[PDB]
Design a protein around this ligand. Structure first.
Ligand SMILES: *[C@@H]1O[C@H](CO)[C@@H](O[C@@H]2O[C@H](CO)[C@@H](O)[C@H](O)[C@H]2NC(C)=O)[C@H](O)[C@H]1NC(C)=O
Ligand SMILES: *[C@@H]1O[C@H](CO)[C@@H](O[C@@H]2O[C@H](CO)[C@@H](O)[C@H](O)[C@H]2NC(C)=O)[C@H](O)[C@H]1NC(C)=O
Ligand SMILES: *[C@@H]1O[C@H](CO)[C@@H](O[C@@H]2O[C@H](CO)[C@@H](O)[C@H](O)[C@H]2NC(C)=O)[C@H](O)[C@H]1NC(C)=O
Ligand SMILES: *[C@@H]1O[C@H](CO)[C@@H](O)[C@H](O)[C@H]1NC(C)=O
Ligand SMILES: *[C@@H]1O[C@H](CO)[C@@H](O)[C@H](O)[C@H]1NC(C)=O
Lengths: 90, 152, 49, 49
């Protein structure tokens, strides 16, 4: 180690468990409320409606999500699997 | 040795002052950007000009610094509502143009998303796109068609 | 923080009916005292040597 | 060695203050990144999204 000559290290105030808890809480907030929990009280919204709201901010409409929701969901799940597999391979 | 030690102390002080000046430059650039966006207009960056939806900011003079009195928009009272993404009328699918479909117990209304104000579902607040089968969570109702009565 | 659970459903929404105007305070320094230091008055006193 | 470092204890104090400021700086850096919500939310037991 490197602590034998007076060069002691300081443990962080927040351990990795608390960082994991914070990230999980933020993830639950953004999948259950969208952005209202980050700008006030936490509301509730279905995820397809949040996806439609996010679609309506980039110049596209909301019916093109409700008409190919299965395609969009399969694409997102494939993307999540692909990024996990790519991360597994620094 | 006095000159060498004094030079070492002066160099250490100069490096500390330079690091402090770099930090001050970063803070001043952040303050200038905040004054350009949140004060000199309305910034769409969420959680940048304070917690909540930013409306405006009031800058005030401070000794060797600046403060910002941001005006935010945070909701207080919320309710519970059963919602649907689309509505079926006559083999057609109606979607809200600028709102959301909500029902209290037996009637369905269209309201704006960030504030509650129920309105009657007509053909002027909904748009027709497709048929009934494609949408998963579709709900039966009638659209008013405000023109029919008028044309009589 | 406060341990709370938000109810989620595929056909349930929460929209607000009231709002409060809040003022948030932020402190951002832009400058500090400017000091000028020279070696002649600091390192030396009144001696030519 | 400490008898001669009595003459450089002021530099030692400057280095100790800089190290303490660095440590509290890294302690404060984590708070502005992850501690954005003060309420700990949870996911529903049935994962139907
Ligand atoms: C849901 O909202 C509707 C509209 O606000 C309510 O319908 C009204 O109810 C009042 C109370 O008796 C009547 O006086 C009105 O004539 C009704 N309007 C119409 C157009 O029928 C309805 O009662 C609400 N339902 C629940 C369960 O609260
Ligand atoms: C919404 O309306 C449609 C059509 O008005 C209903 O679909 C009918 O369902 C019955 C029995 O469920 C069938 O016998 C008919 O053939 C269907 N017609 C069509 C055109 O599909 C549907 O059931 C209604 N949904 C609800 C929840 O009442
Ligand atoms: C929204 O919130 C405001 C703030 O509390 C409410 O205003 C209060 O209303 C009560 C009763 O009407 C008064 O006694 C208070 O003096 C009001 N406070 C202020 C600061 O004006 C308002 O009534 C709420 N609106 C709704 C629809 O709930
Ligand atoms: C009304 O709101 C409460 C708030 O938690 C919720 O538990 C309840 O399910 C809501 N009612 C309906 C019918 O969804
Ligand atoms: C919502 O999810 C529940 C449980 O999976 C299901 O029974 C119900 O049919 C769903 N409703 C819609 C509109 O998808």
């Amino acid at each position: 180690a490197q602590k034998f000559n007076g060069l002691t290290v300081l443990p962080p105030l927040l351990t990795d468990e608390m960082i994991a808890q914070y990230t999980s809480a933020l993830l639950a907030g953004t999948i259950t409320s969208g952005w209202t929990f980050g700008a006030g009280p936490a509301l509730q919204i279905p995820f397809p409606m949040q996806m439609a709201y996010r679609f309506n901010g980039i110049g596209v409409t909301q019916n093109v999500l409700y008409e190919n929701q299965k395609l969009i969901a399969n694409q997102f799940n494939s993307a999540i699997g692909k990024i996990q597999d790519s991360l597994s391979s620094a | 040795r006095l000159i060498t030690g004094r030079l070492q102390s002066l160099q250490t002080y100069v490096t500390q002052q330079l690091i402090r000046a770099a930090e001050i430059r970063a803070s001043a650039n952040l303050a200038a950007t905040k004054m350009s966006e949140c004060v000199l207009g309305q910034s769409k960056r969420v959680d940048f000009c304070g917690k909540g939806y930013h409306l405006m900011s009031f800058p005030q003079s401070a000794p060797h610094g600046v403060v910002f009195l941001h005006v935010t928009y945070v909701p207080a009272q919320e309710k519970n509502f059963t919602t649907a993404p689309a509505i079926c009328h006559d083999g057609k699918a109606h979607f809200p143009r600028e709102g959301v479909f909500v029902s209290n117990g037996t009637h369905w209304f269209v309201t704006q998303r960030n504030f509650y104000e129920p309105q009657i579902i007509t053909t002027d607040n909904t748009f027709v796109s497709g048929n009934c089968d494609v949408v998963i969570g579709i709900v039966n109702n009638t659209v008013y068609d405000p023109l029919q009565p008028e044309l009589d | 923080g406060a341990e709370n659970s938000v109810a989620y459903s595929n056909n349930s929404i929460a929209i607000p009916t009231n709002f409060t105007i809040s003022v948030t305070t932020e402190i951002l320094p832009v400058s500090m005292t400017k000091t000028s230091v020279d070696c002649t008055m600091y390192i030396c006193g009144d001696s030519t040597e | 060695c400490s008898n001669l470092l009595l003459q450089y204890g002021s530099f030692c104090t400057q280095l100790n203050r800089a190290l303490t400021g660095i440590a509290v700086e890294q302690d404060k850096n984590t708070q502005e990144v992850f501690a954005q919500v003060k309420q700990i939310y949870k996911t529903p037991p049935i994962k139907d999204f």
